Scaffold this active site. Structure first.
Site, PDB file in Angstrom:
ATOM      1  N   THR A 102       0.836  -1.211   0.000  1.00  0.00           N
ATOM      2  CA  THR A 102       0.000   0.000   0.000  1.00  0.00           C
ATOM      3  C   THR A 102       0.868   1.257   0.000  1.00  0.00           C
ATOM      4  O   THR A 102       2.059   1.202   0.306  1.00  0.00           O
ATOM      5  CB  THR A 102      -0.985   0.062   1.201  1.00  0.00           C
ATOM      6  OG1 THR A 102      -0.266   0.221   2.430  1.00  0.00           O
ATOM      7  CG2 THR A 102      -1.866  -1.189   1.277  1.00  0.00           C
ATOM      8  N   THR A 103       0.261   2.387  -0.345  1.00  0.00           N
ATOM      9  CA  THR A 103       0.985   3.651  -0.444  1.00  0.00           C
ATOM     10  C   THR A 103       1.248   4.233   0.953  1.00  0.00           C
ATOM     11  O   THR A 103       0.399   4.147   1.839  1.00  0.00           O
ATOM     12  CB  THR A 103       0.222   4.680  -1.311  1.00  0.00           C
ATOM     13  OG1 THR A 103      -0.206   4.066  -2.538  1.00  0.00           O
ATOM     14  CG2 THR A 103       1.105   5.886  -1.637  1.00  0.00           C
TER      15      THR A 103
END
Ligand SMILES: [Cl-]
Ligand SMILES: [Mg+2]
Lengths: 231, 241, 235, 111, 243, 244, 250, 240, 195
Positions: E30-31
């Protein structure tokens, strides 16, 4: 293929195949369900037998008066991890006179499983665990996977055909979360949830295994004629 | 062909892992240069900051090992820092055990011996770096000693390292043929830095701004790096001549 | 080659699954649990007639209230038995009591997975651990090299296991007497054994609360063999 | 020189009946001629209908009780919640005490 | 070939393919972002809501080191936790010996050397995380980003994970438009926006925003989580910008 | 991990042979021939140096024959470096026995221990075996004059006459032909040299390509003397038997 | 973590070859030529100083090394492997000998200790052999002057004269013609320079040639006076000027 | 330390290293054990490709573990020395703690346990050796003969053989040995043992070794001439 | 433990050793044999600290018996005594030393000569025509200086030994309950039952 000989090796797409194969052992294991309200937390486990002459493999293990788990996969690995949890719960009590937080319990299991995935020689744990507990911040349910990933949830299920029970709990979320001060009804919801993962077989007296922990309830396991009420 | 994976001999008497570590040296695409004055030793290196989000002050391949010794690295930063931290510890320990500051050439030998161990022992890989050590040694004077992944080391009149190392090397060779001496016959270190930058510009054929370069200077009893404004002042002096 | 503690793509340990194949090659062992006692019986299987069959020790005492039968690479069982005996006696020293049959089995099964790169490979032998305690009464356990153990009313392990287990499925009920169980082990052993069953190539044993764990004599087993043959001919 | 022992005083008393048993103890804790507490309990419910006291040097006494309470807990985990009998508890305590034969717990223990 | 099967093996290029393979695990995750500001730093992360059954606010991914350093990472979450555990030990022994809390550059090298050590042997695996971290020390604010190879640099803004390129582009605009500097409270609001914009690269499952910050003025130099009114204010700011 | 690169030196073949032991014996078969001959009144050790160069210092050299104590010597065939590791162990083991019992070590006890060391390298430890075969020539008051051999397998056996190294097949046939039990040392000296002279891969056998040693009771009254032959002494004994 | 390479990386092949030793010898073959000649009153060892760059100061790199005051060493093959061997060789001379007997070891025994180190790299776990052949020249009171060669296997041989490395085959032939048992030290230095010119290609002077002797005692090089028994080191490294003097009358 | 798991399971449930160690035993020279009514006899083959041997000093095939127990073997000779040494040490250690010499069953059990430990220990290969262990327990006149093998299984035998062509000599013993009536005397037992080796050996000269063990630590090795008399007697009766 | 004596004569070695085992104010036993046979022609008597004596004797006995089996050969008395001395020499610088004094009487079958070795707990070995440990020596040595001859028979040696025991019984403070006498010669070890 060439990158699944040991846990120390990454694949070209960034995958750890030995960890994924350990994850596969959980999918082969018998179904177990976890769910909680604000006052209580419940484990429901479908036990499995070798044949009619054999006993049914015990799925639920107690860790302290306020905490315990259900297993799915390699049972000896669950014994190793539950024993580690018993010690950490016990260390917290003897040294700090403090009941171990369920969140910290998860953090400790994560870090234990991780070390096995980064070193040569060892192997990942081949089991998934559902930890329930009641601590200073109310009721809790955790899902442990042997990749290391631990997740706090309202409800969940792991094992074979666990997607049926997991969908049910996703629909029932708003109902069962507000079953406060009522143990029997929260178990009933859990028994109805695990029933969505059944095929051909049904819940019998020596097949079902239930456990509960809550506000004024120690972690206790129900088997045999004690679970006949919920069939 | 498992003789290419670990540091054991191939049929033609070669260590392929050592050779491939040499190729890791140029992975950063940075050229360094080192020269000696009368009183000083100057080292210069290219500074390339491609990403706009990077903090340019933290991007550096020059290291202050001890008060007297400086080190520039050609190679990836993790291995560069690994080598730097060890050199620092070795220089500190030397002072404590033997009661005087570790010479540049002795540190170079020590780091070279460590690099040699990685070429012989199987479990340890070589570091993909070339370490250029510089100082004004109290016995030998201005000093340039350089280490590589093979465990080889030697002193230098001057030296260069990087992808366009050979162009810089021959540029310096032709100067010392002409001057007939082992060093830059110059009084101040400022003009020795100006020499170093000038001859890099001629060899590489590129112009430099203040942020395109990184300069380290070794004098008697201290080694220090120059700031952007110290380099800018130095670039202005070259331009006005 | 490949690691000893490696998982297969199906989620099983290669070495554990291969050790189970070794156990299938081993000689047959059968256990039957009743309310009057637990019976354990084995196929001796002498490789040659010159071998003195009474020296084949495939049924073994752990304590006075716990017995053990084996099948597979029987040499591997020596250190398992040694550990079991020590565990049983040590518990008696620490707690002034008999040790639970389940707790003994669990202690043995902890050794099982202590292998890797600890010992170099899993055990190549399965154990039937039969015993009695005050809490859970007469018990029969099947202890594998996977580290898993199942309690059983009756269980067969070894080369004739799948054939014998199906036979035990039909024959076992909750009201079996000890005498009935003795004959049933002999009956099922005679069915799955290659050579013809007699007192020299098969051995019986039991564990009762009163008399403890006893290996039967060749004279006593011979009479139970003779009693069995007469009863089958009688209808 | 450092002396690792001390005397916290007090006294305890156990009597056994036909279908019951008592374990009494005073609540005073002392060092030399000073009172430390007028109410510091030293008779403890350890679970499984076992009461225990370890009178003498309170630090060693508390350590021992704490260890036995923990021993009861692990007996339940390892042996399927089985009730620890009084005779089994006694033998377990002998091993706790003798484990420190060459640096003893300075306590008279009664259960 | 076979140069990619074993860690610490140089290929003929001069590359350690096992480390590059670990970077693929990071890119899959995920970012997460980091924003340096006037007198401190701000961290933010995308938490994918896999199910309704996940308890909101109770699967915390940003971790604190000592009292003044914040750490966030993308990739294999357990590997990130292992790195923080080491970080905490490194920070503890520094404070034990030298009294002062560990400086951020000092701390950055302690992780860097540890991560680099996991590229030196075939008996260990490289870390499957890029770690964004930083805090406030005696010399002011510092932001860092550390990669599987052991490589780290200081940053004005940093981003990693599946939506790194979107976030990097958005970060580059903030550096250009605010040369004199960005404030701490602004950086929290911008962080929210950049996570919401970077969520476009992971938009099947909806997500949960989590922000933390160190600031000399706003948090008194200590690491804290953004919660309650200030969190909702940052969410509303991000919601308004996407529409 | 490192498993990938492990040769597995201490394993069985499908046929029940130790790979590395067999290959180490193949190495030894190319080494210079060494011969031991046991007589009633002494023992001879003869050995052929490996292709000598004219500029090799011959008088201050030791390649084949080594002294273990005053009563025992060995002839080497294989890797010299490996042999020296084992020799220094054997020398030490002899002095341990002397220190313990105040008696010179019996020949077999020294041989057994040195052979047990070699055995260990074939069963455990994952290391390559020692590429060495010894001929032990020694005396003690129990068995008198004794000849033994050991090889990389760690197996040792006793002999009246024996050869190791190159051309042992041809050498053993020639020894088996001319050897007899009532033989003297001077006759055994002649047999040792004649055997090497026929089995040699060289054109002609000369003093500079040989090492020679005797263990006689030729000292004064009931005591053993070790004679490691000098270059000039080998030259004279080679002329005396009529080879040159 | 930890060194998991506890097993031999040098093993016997079906043909009986030890592959890594052979390959190490191949690395020695590639290496620059060095030689040694023994005289009646001394020993000479010599080698070419192959400069990596003209900017590099070839004085700082020492191919000919003092091990003890009366023993010197030179090599052909991999320089780094040689450098660490010289360190270990110097140390073992003290630990296993001088700290016990109060005097420096004789040439043959120091050689033996070096050989031991090189043999262990052939058999021990997780290591390759040393990629060098050494020539060790030395003097001691009871053996006189001596010259030894040490190979990657750990084997060592004494020599009247020999050469190793690049052009060793031609150099050994040249030495066979010129060597006799009545050579004085100066005659041996002359022959060493003649032999080495054949293998060297580029410049041939005192700055590109490294040469040392084991000869008479040097009281001037001792550093102190007063003890009559201590007469100074027999090892002397010839200067750049001293070489060029002998190259004029060549 | 060298840790590698050399002895491991294969897909079909076999430990190949243990099975390949049995092939080394099959290569080894034949050894036979026959027990009579009041004795045990251990016969051993010696290959005759080795002439110019010194039989005074060459290691004998039968080894005394104590004064009342003996051990012969087939397989790797170097490996056997390690087992014999360990057994000899344990024999003295048993006398020291129990104040009584080992039983033949106990000594066998110990040696077999050592052999088993090498089939599941890291860094080691199994012993390429099978043993025949024979003797008489203390204050007991009942003869004992046991066999061990690389796997670690052990068992008692009325008569048994191991080594090369052992299946031929086992075939001989299976018909010629009567359980109801074993060899009543020493002579009868030795003859049956020599007969059984003569099926395999080649010549009855310096190829057969015989060692007789009787009760109360009465062990003696037969000489060439004594054995040659049995060989001469058997061949004359054979021609019929 | 207290009295151990030894006399080497022409053709044998004779060892006398007291029978009393006292602890405190009680003689616990009056028939104790303070000796172990190390090999068929070697006997070791012992005296010293309680427990240590027997533990040491049996430990030596086990090692010599192990050697005998391994080599199928009896070790010489000189060789055994040297082995015993070294064990005591190690012991004295240990954490807890063996406080045991010994006499080793043996017949060397190769030399056809009896040999008597006296070794104290420090590891101090001496070969002697006659020996004693403890206070016994203070009486017996001067007595044997006078009466001993090197060419005596075994019977003459026993009368000489009787003369020592009589003197010890007259002048020693403690009742040592007589002695067990054993003879070591060419034919091995035998015990004199009536002394
Ligand atoms: Cl160094
Ligand atoms: Mg004395």
């Amino acid at each position: 293929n060439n990158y699944d000989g040991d846990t120390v090796t990454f694949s070209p797409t960034g995958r750890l195949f030995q960890v994924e194969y350990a994850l596969e052992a959980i999918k082969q294991g018998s179904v177990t369900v976890g769910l909680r309200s604000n006052t209580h937390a419940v484990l429901v486990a479908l036990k499995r037998n070798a044949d009619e002459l054999s006993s049914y493999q015990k799925k639920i293990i107690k860790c302290d008066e306020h905490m315990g788990l259900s297993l799915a996969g390699l049972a000896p690995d669950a014994r190793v991890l539950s024993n580690y949890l018993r010690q950490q719960c016990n260390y917290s009590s003897l040294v700090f006179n403090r009941k171990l937080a369920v969140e910290r319990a998860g953090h400790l299991l994560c870090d234990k499983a991780q070390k096995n995935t980064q070193s040569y020689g060892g192997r990942p744990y081949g089991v998934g665990l559902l930890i329930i507990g009641y601590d200073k911040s109310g009721a809790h349910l955790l899902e442990f996977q042997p990749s290391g990933n631990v997740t706090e949830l309202y409800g969940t299920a792991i094992g074979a055909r666990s997607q049926g029970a997991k969908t049910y709990l996703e629909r029932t979320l708003d109902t069962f979360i507000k079953i406060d001060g009522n143990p029997d009804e929260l178990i009933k919801a859990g028994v109805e949830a695990i029933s969505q993962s059944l095929r051909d077989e049904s819940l019998t007296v020596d097949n079902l295994s239930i456990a509960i922990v809550g506000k004024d309830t120690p972690f206790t396991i129900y088997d045999g004629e004690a679970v006949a009420k919920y069939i | 062909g498992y003789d290419r994976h670990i540091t054991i001999f191939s049929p033609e008497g070669r260590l392929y892992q050592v050779e491939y570590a040499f190729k890791a040296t140029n992975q950063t695409n940075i050229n360094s240069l080192a020269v000696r004055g009368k009183d000083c030793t100057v080292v210069i290196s290219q500074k390339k900051v491609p990403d706009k989000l990077l903090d340019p002050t933290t991007v550096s391949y020059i290291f202050c090992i001890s008060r007297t010794i400086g080190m520039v690295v050609n190679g990836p930063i993790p291995d560069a820092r690994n080598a730097a931290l060890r050199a620092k510890a070795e220089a500190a320990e030397f002072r404590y055990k033997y009661g005087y500051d570790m010479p540049c050439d002795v540190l170079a030998k020590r780091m070279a011996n460590l690099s040699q161990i990685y070429t012989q022992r199987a479990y340890m890989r070589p570091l993909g770096v070339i370490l250029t050590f510089v100082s004004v040694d109290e016995e030998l004077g201005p000093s340039i000693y350089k280490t590589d992944p093979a465990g080889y080391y030697v002193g230098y009149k001057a030296t260069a390292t990087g992808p366009k190392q050979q162009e810089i090397t021959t540029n310096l060779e032709n100067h010392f043929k002409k001057s007939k001496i082992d060093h830059i016959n110059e009084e101040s270190w400022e003009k020795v830095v100006e020499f170093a930058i000038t001859h890099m510009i001629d060899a590489l054929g590129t112009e430099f701004s203040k942020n395109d370069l990184e300069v380290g200077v070794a004098t008697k009893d201290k080694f220090f790096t120059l700031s952007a404004e110290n380099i800018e002042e130095r670039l202005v002096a070259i331009a006005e001549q | 080659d490949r690691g000893v503690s490696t998982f297969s793509p199906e989620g099983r340990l290669f070495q554990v699954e291969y050790s189970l194949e070794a156990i299938k090659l081993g000689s047959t062992a059968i256990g039957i649990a009743t309310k009057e006692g637990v019976v354990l019986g084995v196929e001796k299987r002498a490789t040659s007639p010159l071998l003195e069959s009474d020296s084949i020790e495939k049924i073994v005492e752990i304590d006075r209230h716990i017995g053990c039968a084996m099948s597979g690479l029987t040499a591997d069982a020596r250190s398992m038995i040694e550990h079991a005996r020590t565990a049983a006696v040590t518990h008696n020293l620490y707690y002034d009591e008999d040790i639970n049959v389940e707790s003994l089995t669990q202690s043995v099964c902890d050794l099982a997975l202590r292998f890797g790169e600890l010992m170099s490979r899993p055990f190549g032998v399965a154990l039937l651990i039969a015993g009695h305690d005050a809490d859970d009464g007469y018990q029969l356990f099947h202890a594998e090299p996977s580290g898993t153990f199942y309690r059983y009313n009756a269980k067969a392990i070894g080369s004739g296991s799948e054939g014998a287990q199906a036979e035990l499925l039909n024959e076992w009920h909750s009201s079996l007497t000890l005498k009935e169980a003795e004959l049933l082990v002999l009956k099922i052993l005679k069915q799955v054994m290659e050579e013809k069953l007699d007192e020299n190539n098969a051995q019986l044993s039991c564990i009762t609360k009163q008399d403890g764990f006893k290996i039967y004599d060749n004279e006593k087993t011979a009479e139970l063999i003779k009693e069995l043959k007469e009863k089958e001919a009688a209808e | 020189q450092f002396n690792p022992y001390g005397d916290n005083g007090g006294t305890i008393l156990g009597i056994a009946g036909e279908d019951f048993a008592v374990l009494a103890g005073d609540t005073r804790n002392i060092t030399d001629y000073s009172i430390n507490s007028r109410y510091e309990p030293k008779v403890f419910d350890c679970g499984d209908n076992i009461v225990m006291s370890a009178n003498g040097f309170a630090a060693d006494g508390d350590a021992l009780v704490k260890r036995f309470k923990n021993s009861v807990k692990w007996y339940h985990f390892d042996h399927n919640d089985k009730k620890l009998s009084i005779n089994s508890a006694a033998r377990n305590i002998q091993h706790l005490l003798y484990g420190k034969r060459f640096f003893p717990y300075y306590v008279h223990t009664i259960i | 070939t076979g140069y990619d099967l074993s860690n610490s093996v140089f290929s003929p290029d001069g590359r350690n393919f096992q480390v590059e393979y670990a970077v693929k695990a990071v890119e899959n995750g995920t970012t997460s972002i980091g924003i340096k500001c006037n007198d401190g730093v701000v961290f933010a992360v995308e938490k994918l809501i896999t199910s309704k059954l996940l308890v909101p606010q109770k699967n915390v991914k940003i971790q604190v080191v000592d009292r003044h350093i914040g750490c966030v990472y993308s990739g294999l979450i357990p590997d990130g936790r292992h790195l923080v555990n080491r970080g905490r030990e490194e920070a503890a022994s520094f404070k034990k010996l030298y009294k002062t809390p560990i400086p951020i550059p000092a701390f950055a090298d302690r992780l860097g050397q540890y991560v680099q050590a996991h590229t030196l042997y075939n008996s260990v695996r490289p870390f499957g995380v890029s770690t964004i971290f930083g805090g406030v020390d005696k010399n002011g604010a510092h932001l860092y980003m550390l990669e599987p190879s052991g490589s780290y640099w200081g940053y004005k803004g940093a981003a990693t994970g599946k939506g790194r390129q979107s976030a990097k582009a958005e970060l580059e605009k903030l550096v250009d438009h605010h040369p004199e500097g960005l404030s701490a409270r602004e950086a929290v609001k911008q962080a929210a926006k950049i996570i919401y914009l970077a969520h476009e690269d992971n938009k099947e499952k909806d997500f949960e925003l989590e922000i933390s910050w160190c600031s000399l003025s706003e948090t008194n130099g200590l690491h804290k989580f953004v919660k309650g009114d200030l969190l909702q204010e940052a969410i509303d700011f991000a919601q308004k910008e996407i529409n | 991990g490192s498993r990938r690169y492990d040769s597995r030196t201490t394993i069985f073949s499908p046929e029940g042979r130790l790979y590395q032991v067999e290959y180490a014996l193949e190495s030894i078969s190319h080494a210079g021939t060494a011969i031991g001959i046991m007589a009633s009144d002494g023992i001879v050790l003869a050995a052929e140096r490996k292709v000598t160069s004219t500029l090799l210092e011959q008088d201050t050299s030791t390649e084949k024959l080594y002294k273990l104590n005053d009563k025992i010597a060995v002839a080497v065939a294989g890797l010299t470096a490996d042999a020296e590791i084992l020799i220094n162990t054997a020398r030490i083991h002899a002095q341990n026995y002397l220190k313990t019992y105040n008696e010179d070590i019996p020949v077999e006890i020294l041989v057994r221990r040195l052979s047990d060391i070699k055995q260990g390298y074939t069963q455990h430890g994952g290391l390559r075996p020692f590429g060495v075969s010894f001929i032990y020539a020694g005396y003690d008051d129990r068995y008198g004059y004794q000849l033994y051999t050991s090889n990389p397998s760690g197996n040792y056996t006793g002999w009246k006459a024996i050869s190791v190294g190159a051309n042992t097949s041809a050498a053993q046939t020639l020894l088996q032909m001319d050897y007899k039990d009532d033989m003297k040392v001077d006759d055994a000296i002649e047999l040792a040299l004649k055997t090497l002279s026929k089995t040699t891969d060289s054109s002609a056998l000369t003093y500079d390509r040989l090492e020679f040693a005797t263990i006689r009771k030729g000292a004064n009254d009931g005591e053993v003397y070790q004679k490691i032959f000098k270059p000039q002494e080998i030259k004279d004994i080679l002329v005396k038997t009529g080879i040159t | 973590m930890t060194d998991r390479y506890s097993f031999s990386l040098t093993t016997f092949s079906p043909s009986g070859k030890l592959g890594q030793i052979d390959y190490a010898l191949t690395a020695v073959k590639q290496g620059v030529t060095s030689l040694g000649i023994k005289a009646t009153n001394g020993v000479v060892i010599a080698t070419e100083k192959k400069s990596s760059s003209p900017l590099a100061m070839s004085e700082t790199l020492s191919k000919v090394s003092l091990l003890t005051p009366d023993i010197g060493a030179v090599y052909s093959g991999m320089g780094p492997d040689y450098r660490v061997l010289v360190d270990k060789s110097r140390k073992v001379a003290h630990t296993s000998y001088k700290r016990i007997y109060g005097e420096y070891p004789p040439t043959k025994l120091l050689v033996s200790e070096v050989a031991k180190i090189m043999q262990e790299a052939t058999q021990s776990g997780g290591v390759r052999p040393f990629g060098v052949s050494l020539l060790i020249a030395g003097h001691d009171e009871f053996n006189g002057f001596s010259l030894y060669q040490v190979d990657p296997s750990g084997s060592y041989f004494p020599w009247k004269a020999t050469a190793i490395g690049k052009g060793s085959v031609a150099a050994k032939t040249f030495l066979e013609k010129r060597w006799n048992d009545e050579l004085e030290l100066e005659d041996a230095i002359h022959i060493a320079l003649l032999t080495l010119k054949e293998s060297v290609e580029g410049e041939f002077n005192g700055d590109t040639i490294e040469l040392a002797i084991i000869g008479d005692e040097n009281p001037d090089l001792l550093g102190y006076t007063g003890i009559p028994t201590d007469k100074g080191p027999r090892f002397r490294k010839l200067t750049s000027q001293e070489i060029n003097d002998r190259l004029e009358a060549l | 330390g060298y840790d590698r798991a050399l002895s491991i399971f294969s897909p079909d449930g076999h430990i190949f290293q243990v099975e390949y160690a049995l092939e080394a035993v099959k290569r080894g020279t034949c050894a036979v054990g026959v027990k009579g009514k009041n004795c045990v006899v251990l016969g051993c083959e010696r290959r005759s490709t080795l002439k110019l041997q010194d039989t005074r000093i060459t290691p004998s095939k039968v080894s005394k573990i104590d004064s009342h127990v003996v051990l012969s073997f087939s397989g790797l000779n170097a490996d056997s020395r390690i087992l014999i040494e360990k057994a000899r040490v344990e024999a003295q250690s048993h006398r020291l703690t129990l104040e009584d010499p080992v039983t033949v069953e106990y000594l066998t059990r110990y040696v077999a346990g050592v052999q088993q430990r090498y089939t599941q220990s890291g860094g080691v290969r199994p012993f390429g050796v099978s043993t025949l262990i024979a003797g008489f327990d203390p204050r007991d006149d009942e003869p004992k003969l046991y066999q061990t093998e690389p796997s670690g299984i052990y068992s008692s035998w009325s008569a048994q053989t191991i080594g090369r062509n052992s299946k031929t000599v086992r075939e001989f013993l299976e018909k010629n040995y009567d359980r109801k009536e074993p060899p009543a005397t020493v002579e009868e037992c030795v003859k049956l043992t020599v007969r059984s080796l003569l099926e395999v050996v080649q010549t009855g000269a310096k190829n057969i070794e015989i060692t007789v063990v009787k009760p109360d630590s009465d062990i003696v090795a037969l000489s060439s001439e004594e054995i040659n008399q049995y060989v001469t007697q058997i061949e004359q009766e054979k021609q019929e | 433990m207290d009295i151990i004596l030894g006399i080497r004569v022409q053709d044998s070695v004779i060892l006398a050793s007291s029978k009393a085992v006292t602890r405190g104010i009680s003689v616990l036993k009056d028939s104790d044999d303070k000796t172990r046979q190390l090999s068929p022609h070697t006997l070791m008597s012992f005296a010293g600290e309680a427990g240590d004596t027997v533990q040491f004797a049996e430990y030596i006995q086990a090692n010599i018996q192990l050697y005998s089996i391994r080599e199928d050969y009896e070790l010489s008395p000189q060789a055994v005594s040297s082995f015993v001395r070294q064990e005591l020499a190690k012991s004295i610088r240990s954490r807890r030393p063996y406080q045991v004094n010994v006499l080793i009487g043996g017949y060397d079958k190769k030399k056809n000569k009896p040999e008597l070795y006296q070794i104290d707990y420090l590891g101090t070995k001496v070969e002697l025509p006659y020996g004693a440990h403890g206070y016994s020596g203070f009486y017996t040595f001067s007595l044997l200086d006078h009466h001993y001859r090197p060419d005596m028979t075994t019977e003459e040696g026993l009368d000489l030994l009787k003369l020592c025991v009589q003197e010890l019984e007259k002048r020693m403070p403690m009742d040592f309950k007589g002695v067990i006498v054993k003879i070591v010669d060419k034919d091995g070890i035998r015990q004199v039952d009536d002394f």
